[PDB]
Amino acid sequence: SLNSTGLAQAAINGLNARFYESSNARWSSDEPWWISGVALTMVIEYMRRSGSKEYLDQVEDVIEVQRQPLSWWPSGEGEFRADATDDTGWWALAMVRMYDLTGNEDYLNISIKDEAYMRQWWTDTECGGGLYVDIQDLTYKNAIANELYLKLVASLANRAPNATIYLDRAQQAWTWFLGSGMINGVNLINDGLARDSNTGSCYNNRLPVWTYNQGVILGALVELYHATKDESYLLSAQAIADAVLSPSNGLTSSSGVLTETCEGSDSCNQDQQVFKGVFALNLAELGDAVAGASSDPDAGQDYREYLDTNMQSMYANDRSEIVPTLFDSSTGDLYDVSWSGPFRNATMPKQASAIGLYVANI
Numbered sequence: 177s178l179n180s181t182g183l184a185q186a187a188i189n190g191l192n193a194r195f196y197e198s199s200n201a202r203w204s205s206d207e208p209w210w211i212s213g214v215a216l217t218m219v220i221e222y223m224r225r226s227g228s229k230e231y232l233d234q235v236e237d238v239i240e241v242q243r244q245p246l247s248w249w250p251s252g253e254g255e256f257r258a259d260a261t262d263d264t265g266w267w268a269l270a271m272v273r274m275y276d277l278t279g280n281e282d283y284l285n286i287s288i289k290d291e292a293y294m295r296q297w298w299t300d301t302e303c304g305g306g307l308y309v310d311i312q313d314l315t316y317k318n319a320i321a322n323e324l325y326l327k328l329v330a331s332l333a334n335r336a337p338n339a340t341i342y343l344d345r346a347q348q349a350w351t352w353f354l355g356s357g358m359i360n361g362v363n364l365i366n367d368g369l370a371r372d373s374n375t376g377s378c379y380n381n382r383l384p385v386w387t388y389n390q391g392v393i394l395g396a397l398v399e400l401y402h403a404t405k406d407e408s409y410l411l412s413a414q415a416i417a418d419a420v421l422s423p424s425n426g427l428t429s430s431s432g433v434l435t436e437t438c439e440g441s442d443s444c445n446q447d448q449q450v451f452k453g454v455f456a457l458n459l460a461e462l463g464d465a466v467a468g469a470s471s472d473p474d475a476g477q478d479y480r481e482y483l484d485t486n487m488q489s490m491y492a493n494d495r496s497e498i499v500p501t502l503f504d505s506s507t508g509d510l511y512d513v514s515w516s517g518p519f520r521n522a523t524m525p526k527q528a529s530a531i532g533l534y535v536a537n538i
């Protein structure tokens with residue numbers, strides 16, 4: 177009915193025409209640096225699922241420049257090692273995807289360097305495990321930094337030469353995450369952990385439920401299944417997904433459209449504008465593993481129909497075409513944050529989220 181591959185390329189062309197900076201090999205320097213790594217992930221995954229290699233040259237140029245020691249964190253010594261573990265995690269998983277697309281061991285070596293870098297802030301003395309997100313302060317063990325790390329060690333357990341240690345690290349990380357309390361009573365993941373003032377024990381801080389905190393964990397459990405052939409990991413991922421799928425949990429609208437919790441008040445900041453695309457791409461990873469792990473043709477079809485239903489709503493209601501000029505013949509599509517509301521503007525985080533949903537249906 178619809179060509180998700182064609183609309184994905186048009187969305188990537190719209191991302192490049194309005195937000196790419198050739199002089200810096202980066203999308204929107206006025207936006208967070210880690211979202212540029214998410215945009216790189218979506219472009220690499222587009223090329224992987226579609227078999228195309230249009231943006232290969234552009235993406236290697238981005239890596240070569242962003243590999244260098246960051247001006248705001250020279251102690252990281254480059255290779256995407258930043259002042260925050262989650263920032264490093266986004267780029268590390270992008271290198272895992274580039275290694276899957278090209279097979280170049282160079283990109284896998286970056287993810288290995290990033291794993292050892294992030295492990296430096298894993299402590300068993302607080303919360304019984306987990307790593308911090310604020311490297312400079314060490315005051316928060318949130319969900320995203322531990323979900324990105326868990327998916328990284330689980331991915332290296334399937335690709336790295338010394339994969340046994342990465343499997344043990346991933347198995348012990350999922351054990352800590354499941355026992356941390358971040359997964360609440362409805363199988364949704366709150367934002368992070370809080371520390372008791374007197375006892376020191378950690379507990380769910382009951383902070384907002386973000387869509388991207390229910391996606392990265394799915395890809396981690398998928399990789400944990402590919403490394404162990406244990407369908408128990410998928411069943412855990414299906415429970416988290418099914419909770420997001422249920423309209424009674426507030427994440428799925430009555431029309432069946434994914435809605436971030438800030439969309440109602442129109443207060444989604446620069447970070448939250450990209451959350452939805454991250455979940456969609458990871459949900460496609462979970463659906464692909466579920467359909468292959470069983471013989472039922474209807475396996476994972478609930479997840480495919482959801483991504484399809486969300487695509488048509490974003491197409492019909494959130495799309496906007498770039499105006500071609502007599503000097504600038506750049507064609508492409510632009511998208512806002514609400515996958516069902518109206519198009520009012522378009523920024524790079526919302527554009528990257530739109531690409532993720534199109535790629536999640538290829």
Ligand SMILES: OC[C@H]1O[C@H](O[C@H]2[C@@H](O)[C@H](O)[C@@H](CO)O[C@@H]2O)[C@@H](O)[C@@H](O)[C@@H]1O
Pocket residue numbers: 316318319320367368383386447448
């Ligand atoms: O006051 C700091 C600010 O950041 C922390 O939230 C981070 C992350 O855990 C959240 O998922 C996203 C959501 O926008 O923002 C940060 O990256 C928390 O300490 C949060 O309470 C706070 O607003």
Ligand SMILES: OC[C@H]1O[C@H](O)[C@@H](O)[C@@H](O)[C@@H]1O
Pocket residue numbers: 315316317368369370371381
């Ligand atoms: O309250 C839980 C959590 O919320 C804050 O936003 C963070 O900065 C942490 O320091 C704290 O532990």
